[PDB]
Amino acid sequence: AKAHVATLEGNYSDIVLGRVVAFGDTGWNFKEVDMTFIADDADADSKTTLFAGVLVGEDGTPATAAAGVFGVLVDRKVLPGVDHYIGVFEPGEKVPMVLAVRGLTLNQLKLKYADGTAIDAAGIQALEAQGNQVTDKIVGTQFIGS
């Protein structure tokens, strides 16, 4: 007797805790990269594995170690709760995406590699080379009590 349930976790403004607002423009911090949305083999049914907060390389391929780290995926099309894209893309279809690179404050608890592993020291210093304040001074990491 299923009781259908839907859920979400996190926002856009919890992976990016703050910006540096370049007066001269608004696109200073970001870079636009092109990636494959739906898996290369899965049918046109699978919600892709691009949860916001994954680390991607310079050419858009998802990161796997500290070596291939360039930016943090923050595109609106993969934010939690944004799930009306299921059949809109064919397998292997390749779409632009947005990465945040420069002058940003980053939550250390959200950053992950493509597999799911949490970011490590090597990845932290790699990102922090771009001028990103990777910080772990977050309040809210324990829910309700239990």
Added chain:
Amino acid sequence: AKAHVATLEGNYSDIVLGRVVAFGDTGWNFKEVDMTFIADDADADSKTTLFAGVLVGEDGTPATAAAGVFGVLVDRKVLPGVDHYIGVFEPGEKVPMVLAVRGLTLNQLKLKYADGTAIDAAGIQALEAQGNQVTDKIVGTQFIGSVL
């Protein structure tokens, strides 16, 4: 008889002439690390040898070589005229210190190594790599010479 008198000269802005202020986290330019305040093997009232403007590596120890520089110590606890933290810490005790890292218009003449030696070209390169501008010219002042 002797008149015990003192002078309170000194300032903070001389070490940080300007900052890039982010509309988000205003602490984007700083980092906190645990340095040793009182000398490890000295007595209980041996006030710290640390002074504002000393280069500090990421490990927290005061820098001794250009390659070991990561930031500038600008902690409030070491600024001139407020250095009353005398005998308040045990020898060798750790304490979090504020370091200035990126987005600063520093003053070259006030950057010095652990022993007080002035910063060199390699140190300038290493410190500017973070995105810092190390100015080499502050006007200075001449107070009273009877001539100028």
Added chain:
Amino acid sequence: NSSLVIIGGVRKDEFFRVKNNPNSYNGFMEQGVYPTPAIPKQSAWP
């Protein structure tokens, strides 16, 4: 021994998960005698 004490309403993650649940029924749904369009029928905000 990691989740002995649970306090509700002190986390954004836990607040929105309950708030956005389509099956949730909260206090702002008190229809009373007969239903009126002045009272929401869904928990999540528009």
Added chain:
Amino acid sequence: NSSLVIIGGVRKDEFFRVKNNPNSYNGFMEQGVYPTPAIPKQSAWP
């Protein structure tokens, strides 16, 4: 045997740690029936 007794709000280091936590939800966020721009959505002061 060093941290038996804890009292909150009596240290600046601890007070700002909770205040600046992006996940914190405190009493000043009581949105009520529907959200209004007169009530903050973040714990930290501007």
Added chain:
Amino acid sequence: EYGLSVVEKVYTQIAVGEYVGKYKVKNLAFRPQASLSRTNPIVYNSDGSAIVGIKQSLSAFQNYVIIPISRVMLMNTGGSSSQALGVSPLVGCYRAWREKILIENLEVVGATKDMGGVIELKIPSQILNKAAMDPSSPEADMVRGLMSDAANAHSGEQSFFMLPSDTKDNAPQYSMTLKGIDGMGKQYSTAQLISDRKKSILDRLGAGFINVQTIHTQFVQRVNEIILEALNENLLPQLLALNDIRLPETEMPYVKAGEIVDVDMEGFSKAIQRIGAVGYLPKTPKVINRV
């Protein structure tokens, strides 16, 4: 607000008009207190006897000097003639304002933190621990259900609670109680603290009647007279000197400010009759124009 006010008089010649050849006043240029010198605003003699001028900061001449005393009209209040920097009416209020603010802050946080009647649930730790280490066990599902059901627990048409009644010791395994303050609440009644401080602040400005000839009307007359003294005794004699109109003391005209309280039509109309019915009111156009 600042105990002090600086106005500079500038005169100009008339080109075409009724009084061609004479000198008007171009502007009574207000010098803001904020743009003045922050170090010494007012400069004296070699001794502390008199004033020679007023200094303005050099930073006010930029976009994003000493003015002689003879050109400046100084107004100040709250002090004697020997206090160039007058006492602002906010001096005195300041300590009360500091307290008034702090108390209001305590009321807001106090009302938010009065968790009376909050729901507390007690569950054996065997279930809590099993869920934490076995996310795919029946204990985990029930724990996740509680975390959402308890958050939504309001009062309505179907609100109730059903708990197991097992017992292991003098205390039961499962329970549900609503908390309350075990003792006595707050005593100081911060409401009347604020009211006393508000009346403390408004009294210095004569506007304390809002907490409910008068005090407020008499207070306004003080400010009017100070301005009129500067206007009557510093500008008018100098203005006539430039246009060489030299008169005796008894022939100097003066400026009279308006009336701050409106005339009572009922009172005035019946006052004219009582004087008029006897014949003590002269027949002049001045009386006629008053209607």
Added chain:
Amino acid sequence: RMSEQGTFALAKVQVDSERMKAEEIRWPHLIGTAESMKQDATVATGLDMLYTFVEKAFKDFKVIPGESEESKKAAKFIEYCLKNMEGQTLRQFARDAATFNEYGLSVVEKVYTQIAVGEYVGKYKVKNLAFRPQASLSRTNPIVYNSDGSAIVGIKQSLSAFQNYVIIPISRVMLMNTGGSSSQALGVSPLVGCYRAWREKILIENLEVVGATKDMGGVIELKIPSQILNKAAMDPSSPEADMVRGLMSDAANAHSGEQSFFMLPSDTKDNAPQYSMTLKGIDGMGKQYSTAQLISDRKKSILDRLGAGFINVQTIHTQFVQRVNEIILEALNENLLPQLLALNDIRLPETEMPYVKAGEIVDVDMEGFSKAIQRIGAVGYLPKTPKVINRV
């Protein structure tokens, strides 16, 4: 001598005043914070009552001429121009001008046009007193000064207002502002000060709604041995399962009526009974702060700044309206009329300039006025003129 020795420092007095404000009420943001206020039912009401009497005053306006014959002709032409704007009336202008009570500032541009056919053919009317909304102005610098911060050269309007979905010289613009001295171009909105109180007032009202919803006093609690609960969960087709499903529906419908009662087994295993039914209550003391009087203090705090605090129960409210009327009249009497007469080369002495007089905001008392005329009239101090006769 005849030489200025200082500056008004318009460009500095502003830049200090923007720092000394909470950041949600600085220029480019105050435009949004005003319209996100107003939707408070005490803030709207204060502004609405203020505009009620401002419109009334500028409805039955009058132009008062001088003594000479020249002034009387000029007064008639002024009345025609002010009552014949194409698509505009002074009531609409008054209710647009009075917006500085929301934003500290108001901008009106004067446009003149020639007459084609009419009583005054060849002269110049005023086409429209074009209101420039504060929201359509420049968000960066709205007002531009000299190379120094001495005076104002014009007002800038954003380029985004010329689209569907530039600097205007100061000589063409009529500026009205309130709450500040002559050195504050961006006047202090009366909502500055109120803001902190409005923030608190809102938060408290939110706590009352959630607090009343969550006061589960007297809720029904049932205790059942866990043997029955566990058996039902694993045996959906067992007698325990049927009784559990019955309880989940019967307990929800448990109201008070003509047949309400409870019947429970009385078994006992320990000091506590196996089955029980109790109605919960707060074990201690309830809330203490009485949030009701907190809100009342903040409401009177907000309305006092607008002079409309009497609704919480010559006056303060009537005197407050006169302030707004006088500010508008100064701009109308001293910026438009002298320029309007200059275009039609009507040059008069100072004593012969006509002026516009606003109407009366308080209605005349028939009882008081009628018996006031008799008392003056019975003595003979009231002149026999058509002016007195027409007053009836």
Added chain:
Amino acid sequence: TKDMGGVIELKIPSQILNKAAMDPSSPEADMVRGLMSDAANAHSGEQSFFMLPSDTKDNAPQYSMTLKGIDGMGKQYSTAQLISDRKKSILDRLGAGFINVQTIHTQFVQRVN
């Protein structure tokens, strides 16, 4: 400022508190750090509640949560009326005591004149 009536008090077995102090990377340490932040933010709202273990070792329970209150009687002197008496005491010497509510104040001014 010091009338801490209704303040929240928590009781936890000292085994958890001591383990956290000596093992910063143990599950006890994580839960202790969570309590120090969750308890500070514990206000009253739409989702406020408490859930504690119900274990028992002796006549007293292992875990508990109570709101404190003054165990006895509060203050008695009512410092409010003390101040009012002294204010009227001061203003009477200047003849301006009527603000606490030919006159006394008018006659006092004539003396100075």
